[PDB]
Amino acid sequence: VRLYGPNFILQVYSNYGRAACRDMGYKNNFYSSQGISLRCIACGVNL
Amino acid sequence: IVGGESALPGAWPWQVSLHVQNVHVCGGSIITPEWIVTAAHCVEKPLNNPWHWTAFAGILRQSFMFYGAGYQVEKVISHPNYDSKTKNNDIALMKLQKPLTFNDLVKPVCLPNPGMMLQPEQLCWISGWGATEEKGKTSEVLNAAKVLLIETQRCNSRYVYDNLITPAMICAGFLQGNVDSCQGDSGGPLVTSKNNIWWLIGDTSWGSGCAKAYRPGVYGNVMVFTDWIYRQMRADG
Amino acid sequence: ATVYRRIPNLPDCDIDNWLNNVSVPSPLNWERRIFSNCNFNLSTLLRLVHVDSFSCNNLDKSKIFGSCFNSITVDKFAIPNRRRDDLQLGSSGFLQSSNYKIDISSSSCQLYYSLPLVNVTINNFNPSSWNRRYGFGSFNLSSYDVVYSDHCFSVNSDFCPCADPSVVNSCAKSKPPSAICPAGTKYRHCDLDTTLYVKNWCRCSCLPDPISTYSPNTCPQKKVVVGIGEHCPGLGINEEKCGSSCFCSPDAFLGWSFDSCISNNRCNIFSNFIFNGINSGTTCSNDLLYSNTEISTVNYDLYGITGQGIFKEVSAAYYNNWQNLLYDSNGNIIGFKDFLTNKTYTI
Amino acid sequence: VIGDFNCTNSFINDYNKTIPRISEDVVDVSLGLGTYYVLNRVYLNTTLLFTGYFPKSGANFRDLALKGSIYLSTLWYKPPFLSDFNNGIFSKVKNTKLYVNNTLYSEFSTIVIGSVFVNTSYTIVVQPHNGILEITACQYTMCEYPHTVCKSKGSIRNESWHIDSSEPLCLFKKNFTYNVSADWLYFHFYQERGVFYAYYADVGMPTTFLFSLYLGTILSHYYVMPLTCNAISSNTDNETLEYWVTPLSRRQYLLNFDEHGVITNAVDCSS
Ligand SMILES: *[C@@H]1O[C@H](CO)[C@@H](O[C@@H]2O[C@H](CO)[C@@H](O[C@@H]3O[C@H](CO)[C@@H](O)[C@H](O[C@H]4O[C@H](CO)[C@@H](O)[C@H](O)[C@@H]4O)[C@@H]3O)[C@H](O)[C@H]2NC(C)=O)[C@H](O)[C@H]1NC(C)=O
Ligand SMILES: *[C@@H]1O[C@H](CO)[C@@H](O[C@@H]2O[C@H](CO)[C@@H](O[C@@H]3O[C@H](CO)[C@@H](O)[C@H](O)[C@@H]3O)[C@H](O)[C@H]2NC(C)=O)[C@H](O)[C@H]1NC(C)=O
Ligand SMILES: *[C@@H]1O[C@H](CO)[C@@H](O[C@@H]2O[C@H](CO)[C@@H](O[C@@H]3O[C@H](CO)[C@@H](O)[C@H](O)[C@@H]3O)[C@H](O)[C@H]2NC(C)=O)[C@H](O)[C@H]1NC(C)=O
Ligand SMILES: *[C@@H]1O[C@H](CO)[C@@H](O[C@@H]2O[C@H](CO)[C@@H](O)[C@H](O)[C@H]2NC(C)=O)[C@H](O)[C@H]1NC(C)=O
Ligand SMILES: *[C@@H]1O[C@H](CO)[C@@H](O[C@@H]2O[C@H](CO)[C@@H](O)[C@H](O)[C@H]2NC(C)=O)[C@H](O)[C@H]1NC(C)=O
Ligand SMILES: *[C@@H]1O[C@H](CO)[C@@H](O[C@@H]2O[C@H](CO)[C@@H](O)[C@H](O)[C@H]2NC(C)=O)[C@H](O)[C@H]1NC(C)=O
Ligand SMILES: *[C@@H]1O[C@H](CO)[C@@H](O[C@@H]2O[C@H](CO)[C@@H](O)[C@H](O)[C@H]2NC(C)=O)[C@H](O)[C@H]1NC(C)=O
Ligand SMILES: *[C@@H]1O[C@H](CO)[C@@H](O[C@@H]2O[C@H](CO)[C@@H](O)[C@H](O)[C@H]2NC(C)=O)[C@H](O)[C@H]1NC(C)=O
Numbered sequence: 060v061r062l063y064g065p066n067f068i069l070q071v072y073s074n075y076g077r078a079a080c081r082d083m084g085y086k087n088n089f090y091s092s093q094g095i096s097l098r099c100i101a102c103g104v105n106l
Numbered sequence: 107i108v109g110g111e112s113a114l115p116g117a118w119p120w121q122v123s124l125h126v127q128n129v130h131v132c133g134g135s136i137i138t139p140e141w142i143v144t145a146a147h148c149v150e151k152p153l154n155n156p157w158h159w160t161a162f163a164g165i166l167r168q169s170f171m172f173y174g175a176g177y178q179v180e181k182v183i184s185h186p187n188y189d190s191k192t193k194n195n196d197i198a199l200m201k202l203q204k205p206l207t208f209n210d211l212v213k214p215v216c217l218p219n220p221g222m223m224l225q226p227e228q229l230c231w232i233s234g235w236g237a238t239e240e241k242g243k244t245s246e247v248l249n250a251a252k253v254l255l256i257e258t259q260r261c262n263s264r265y266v267y268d269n270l271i272t273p274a275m276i277c278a279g280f281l282q283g284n285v286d287s288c289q290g291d292s293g294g295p296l297v298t299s300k301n302n303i304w305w306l307i308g309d310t311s312w313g314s315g316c317a318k319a320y321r322p323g324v325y326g327n328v329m330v331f332t333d334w335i336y337r338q339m340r341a342d343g
Numbered sequence: 344a345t346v347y348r349r350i351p352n353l354p355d356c357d358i359d360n361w362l363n364n365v366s367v368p369s370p371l372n373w374e375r376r377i378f379s380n381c382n383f384n385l386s387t388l389l390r391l392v393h394v395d396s397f398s399c400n401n402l403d404k405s406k407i408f409g410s411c412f413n414s415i416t417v418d419k420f421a422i423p424n425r426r427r428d429d430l431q432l433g434s435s436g437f438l439q440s441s442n443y444k445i446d447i448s449s450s451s452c453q454l455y456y457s458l459p460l461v462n463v464t465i466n467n468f469n470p471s472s473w474n475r476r477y478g479f480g481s482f483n484l485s486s487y488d489v490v491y492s493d494h495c496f497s498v499n500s501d502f503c504p505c506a507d508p509s510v511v512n513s514c515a516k517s518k519p520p521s522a523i524c525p526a527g528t529k530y531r532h533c534d535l536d537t538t539l540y541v542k543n544w545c546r547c548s549c550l551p552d553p554i555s556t557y558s559p560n561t562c563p564q565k566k567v568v569v570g571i572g573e574h575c576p577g578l579g580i581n582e583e584k585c586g587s588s589c590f591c592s593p594d595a596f597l598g599w600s601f602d603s604c605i606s607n608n609r610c611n612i613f614s615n616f617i618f619n620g621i622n623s624g625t626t627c628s629n630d631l632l633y634s635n636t637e638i639s640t641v642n643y644d645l646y647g648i649t650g651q652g653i654f655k656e657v658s659a660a661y662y663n664n665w666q667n668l669l670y671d672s673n674g675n676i677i678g679f680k681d682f683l684t685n686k687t688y689t690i
Numbered sequence: 691v692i693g694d695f696n697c698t699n700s701f702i703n704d705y706n707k708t709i710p711r712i713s714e715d716v717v718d719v720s721l722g723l724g725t726y727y728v729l730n731r732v733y734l735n736t737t738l739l740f741t742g743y744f745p746k747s748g749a750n751f752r753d754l755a756l757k758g759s760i761y762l763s764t765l766w767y768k769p770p771f772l773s774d775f776n777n778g779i780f781s782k783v784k785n786t787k788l789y790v791n792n793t794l795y796s797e798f799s800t801i802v803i804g805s806v807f808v809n810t811s812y813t814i815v816v817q818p819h820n821g822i823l824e825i826t827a828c829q830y831t832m833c834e835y836p837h838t839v840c841k842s843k844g845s846i847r848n849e850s851w852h853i854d855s856s857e858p859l860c861l862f863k864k865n866f867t868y869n870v871s872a873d874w875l876y877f878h879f880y881q882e883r884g885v886f887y888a889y890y891a892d893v894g895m896p897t898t899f900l901f902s903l904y905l906g907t908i909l910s911h912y913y914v915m916p917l918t919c920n921a922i923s924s925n926t927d928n929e930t931l932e933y934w935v936t937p938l939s940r941r942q943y944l945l946n947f948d949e950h951g952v953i954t955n956a957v958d959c960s961s
């Protein structure tokens with residue numbers, strides 16, 4: 060539900076992938092995941 | 107933008123200029139290719155009927171189209187608890203009728219997640235199409251500058267603003283002046299660098315002139331409104 | 344075995360009389376006196392003054408005895424007990440930054456001496472011109488207390504800690520006091536501005552104080568560091584407490600502190616000797632030629648006459664005020680008079 | 691024209707009728723007038739044949755005293771007033787006594803001896819201060835038109851004979867005292883082999899040794915600067931300024947000393 064820290068960590072008050080971000084905001088365009096991480100959309104581009 | 111320089115066509119693809127009656131009025135930022143973040147004081151009651159709105163992207167010099175080559179805004183959502191007297195909770199959202207497929211010079215910026223732990227005197231950047239020195243005209247090219255973030259305790263001093271900065275707003279700039287944003291830089295992306303990714307933390311709301319001492323810039327704190335944006339995006343679908 | 348007597352052509356310097364003076368200036372004053380065309384004796388000077396420490400820089404004490412200089416300048420001031428460590432050769436302390444700067448690229452000697460607390464007074468005078476122009480009086484401190492500055496400021500001739508009262512009438516928040524500024528000086532820069540709904544909000548410069556200000560580039564009072572041989576141009580003035588004529592309150596002056604100078608029931612004073620030109624001039628030392636000065640009843644150099652002989656204690660009354668040698672018709676010398684002991688000898 | 695500094699040009703004109711006078715008296719060394727004691731030597735019951743610098747017996751003096759009220763003449767700073775210092779001079783000075791509220795003041799003119807009178811060379815100045823003689827040998831920056839101001843009754847001008855912000859380099863500096871109630875004063879100045887000698891006396895008697903100084907250079911010119919006084923003329927009180935000068939030459943004399951070393955009589959070997 061929530062997300063904490065600069066790195067992406069799934070938290071609520073303390074696999075699915077696209078389905079996870081689906082009913083959590085952005086309903087499409089899932090980018091990737093990691094381990095410890097939900098990366099819904101891509102960000103951080105600079106020349 | 108005063109004291110800055112014209113930004114080269116690099117990679118800052120999160121600035122969208124809104125045009126009503128074929129003239130630039132306010133800017134904005136994109137987070138997803140279905141929504142644009144902007145200030146609410148420029149979308150007041152006279153600015154209703156979102157059909158009279160168009161958006162541009164990937165355009166540095168403000169002469170590339172006229173009554174065409176733009177995106178029509180479908181609906182505009184503003185913050186319900188907005189007060190025009192004290193200028194509190196000044197954030198508005200606009201939805202585009204086009205999918206806005208990603209290409210070169212087109213890439214959004216992520217919303218700030220709770221728990222960023224930002225430094226007090228952190229480094230940030232501002233961008234927009236405003237005046238040059240004072241009460242001038244609209245800048246033809248896209249310019250930008252570097253600003254610092256000042257704390258709320260020092261911003262609410264008797265000699266700066268005298269307790270007029272609500273917890274929903276943040277102060278950024280220089281107390282000496284010479285670097286600020288003038289009229290026309292509504293919305294505007296206030297981004298910072300952390301973990302090799304840019305985060306949008308501010309939103310130009312108001313201010314007392316530009317490039318003047320003891321008068322810094324006031325920006326909307328999107329950290330408080332992060333949940334409202336998610337709620338609106340969830341209720342839209 | 345060498346008797347050397349000669350009448351000097353120049354008077355004595357009398358440095359001890361100026362060092363042991365009853366008036367001791369504060370570090371903000373540091374009075375200066377230049378000694379030239381005179382003779383001095385370092386041993387007598389160090390004996391008649393209660394010396395605690397004496398060191399030299401870029402010069403040795405051995406070459407002082409018997410050397411001639413063009414001029415000698417001496418600077419003196421009392422030492423606060425707090426800032427005694429700031430007087431070292433090279434230090435970013437309050438004293439060497441605001442009151443007195445010690446030059447490192449010159450031949451100088453530092454002297455620390457003491458003076459009895461009886462019949463001694465400390466003069467605390469502000470040498471600032473623009474401070475006394477707007478109503479600065481005295482510090483009004485207790486006895487045996489010296490004043491030193493930690494932040495010194497400088498302003499142009501066009502300066503006035505005062506606003507034009509005609510403009511200040513249209514103010515509601517932070518209305519500064521105003522008065523009539525003398526002609527030839529601009530008024531305090533204040534402007535009327537509205538933030539969101541406050542119509543009468545007047546903003547001025549130098550806030551909150553010139554010492555800790557948010558915009559140093561907009562305040563006319565600017566910080567400065569004293570140079571070689573310069574006093575502090577002036578202290579900071581709180582423009583919010585100034586203002587008929589613009590008369591600032593005595594409590595509106597910031598950037599000064601004080602401390603006692605009593606150590607072992609005595610007052611400590613700093614002294615700096617600067618020697619201008621070596622191996623030249625007419626300011627020489629008498630230490631080498633006055634080593635013994637005792638005639639045992641032997642080569643003699645008596646008033647330019649050289650030779651050898653003997654001496655005896657005789658009673659002679661034929662010597663006038665200008666006469667010192669006794670000659671015979673043949674052209675030889677058979678006696679002389681000593682101008683140091685008033686005794687006559689026969690050769 | 692003595693110096694090269696422009697210090698004052700308030701009242702400067704070209705006077706035409708200032709000529710020095712020649713005295714009616716002559717030099718008489720029989721009783722000892724015109725002779726000087728040795729530097730610091732004492733002679734008892736002796737007859738000394740001394741070869742020194744003495745004036746000629748029977749020579750006449752000339753007055754070089756200048757007194758002005760408001761205006762100063764440019765011809766007063768040119769010859770014959772700017773004379774040559776070949777070997778030495780013997781000066782006969784008159785002590786002018788002025789009364790202000792029944793008290794006595796002593797005033798007379800001052801003399802300057804030098805070479806070019808610039809701050810690159812040394813000059814000798816002898817100035818009296820109400821009974822105190824001030825003798826200094828410094829690198830003074832002399833002015834073009836120097837003068838002395840009366841301090842007893844004041845004057846219309848200000849004292850200006852040298853302009854120096856700082857203290858110049860001096861080789862000699864000492865103060866001497868004389869008798870205020872005296873009538874005539876006598877001085878002896880001469881030089882040999884780069885050494886300068888000076889003598890003085892307040893009574894009628896052989897002169898008294900003052901000092902000696904080694905310079906290394908040759909002194910060529912001497913000048914007696916004018917004195918600006920308020921009331922010294924035949925209008926308020928009949929007083930005058932006199933400064934008689936006679937040249938000195940290397941002669942041979944015979945001096946007789948008594949039991950107490952006092953000169954009794956002197957005979958010039960050349961009649
Ligand atoms: C040692 O002696 C030398 C030789 O006398 C002396 O040098 C002289 O210094 C004075 C003072 O600086 C010079 O006088 C100046 O001359 C110029 C022309 O060259 C004038 O323009 C100057 O006039 C200005 O200053 C006046 C005030 O003094 C103003 O009233 C006036 O309006 C001008 O602004 C001034 O008269 C003089 O020229 C030199 N002489 C030479 C040959 O260069 C030197 O100063 C002496 N040293 C010491 C330490 O006394
Ligand atoms: C020697 O020095 C004096 C100064 O001590 C010089 O006198 C000055 O001369 C100038 C030029 O003549 C004077 O200027 C003039 O002033 C009058 C008003 O007084 C004005 O009407 C003229 O147009 C001009 O400006 C100056 O005032 C005067 N100063 C004094 C106090 O006399 C003198 O010229 C020098 N002589 C030289 C060159 O040796
Ligand atoms: C020989 O005697 C004369 C006369 O007594 C001495 O002259 C005096 O010297 C002092 C010391 O400089 C002078 O005092 C100073 O006066 C100036 C003003 O001219 C003042 O600004 C200083 O602060 C200081 O008070 C004094 O005026 C002066 N008197 C006269 C009549 O000229 C001289 O010093 C003696 N020589 C020696 C070697 O002692
Ligand atoms: C001791 O200090 C006093 C006070 O500073 C000196 O008196 C001053 O002397 C200077 C030197 O000429 C004068 O200009 C001042 O006018 C004097 N002021 C007062 C109030 O008299 C005094 O000369 C010093 N003593 C010595 C021996 O230097
Ligand atoms: C001038 O300085 C010399 C150098 O020190 C003094 O000579 C010394 O005098 C003290 C006593 O005053 C003696 O105890 C020393 O032994 C002397 N030194 C030598 C090397 O003999 C001299 O006294 C000073 N003159 C005056 C008048 O104080
Ligand atoms: C040597 O003798 C002379 C003359 O007797 C002394 O000079 C006198 O000193 C006293 C005391 O200071 C003064 O009151 C007199 O005015 C002086 N007279 C003269 C003519 O100068 C001198 O002090 C004696 N020297 C010593 C070392 O005792
Ligand atoms: C300065 O000169 C006067 C003038 O001669 C001296 O006064 C004479 O003093 C003697 C001795 O007492 C008297 O017999 C004379 O009558 C005095 N004459 C006059 C005119 O008063 C005076 O003594 C001299 N000064 C000194 C110190 O000897
Ligand atoms: C200086 O001496 C002369 C000559 O004796 C005085 O001139 C005489 O003054 C009186 C008084 O005014 C007159 O009656 C005479 O006629 C004057 N004589 C001549 C020849 O003019 C002169 O007064 C004296 N000076 C002073 C100041 O009294």
Ligand SMILES: CO[C@]1(C(=O)O)C[C@H](O)[C@@H](NC(C)=O)[C@H]([C@H](O)[C@H](O)COC(C)=O)O1
Nearest residue numbers: 705708756757758759761762763922923924
């Ligand atoms: C009594 O006249 C004085 C004086 O007033 O005290 C005395 C004296 O007659 C004379 N001074 C000189 C050196 O010649 C002097 C001049 O003869 C005049 O004063 C004129 O002087 C000039 C420079 O014009 O006048």
Ligand SMILES: *[C@@H]1O[C@H](CO)[C@@H](O)[C@H](O)[C@H]1NC(C)=O
Nearest residue numbers: 363365458459460461462463
């Ligand atoms: C001042 O105090 C010193 C130190 O004891 C003493 O020597 C001197 O005589 C005193 N002077 C006066 C005038 O009391």
Ligand SMILES: *[C@@H]1O[C@H](CO)[C@@H](O)[C@H](O)[C@H]1NC(C)=O
Nearest residue numbers: 480481482483484485593594
């Ligand atoms: C100096 O301070 C004392 C102590 O506060 C006070 O009694 C006195 O009136 C003050 N004098 C002046 C002139 O300020």
Ligand SMILES: *[C@@H]1O[C@H](CO)[C@@H](O)[C@H](O)[C@H]1NC(C)=O
Nearest residue numbers: 703704705706707708763765
């Ligand atoms: C001064 O005297 C000379 C010679 O008699 C004469 O040529 C000159 O004109 C005179 N000057 C005046 C101003 O009378």
Ligand SMILES: *[C@@H]1O[C@H](CO)[C@@H](O)[C@H](O)[C@H]1NC(C)=O
Nearest residue numbers: 789790791792793842843844
């Ligand atoms: C002379 O005495 C009178 C009366 O006492 C006095 O008015 C005058 O000023 C005195 N003159 C001087 C020069 O002191």
Ligand SMILES: *[C@@H]1O[C@H](CO)[C@@H](O)[C@H](O)[C@H]1NC(C)=O
Nearest residue numbers: 698700701845846847848849
């Ligand atoms: C002497 O000096 C005073 C003081 O400045 C001045 O008023 C006066 O004019 C001067 N006198 C002369 C003749 O320069």
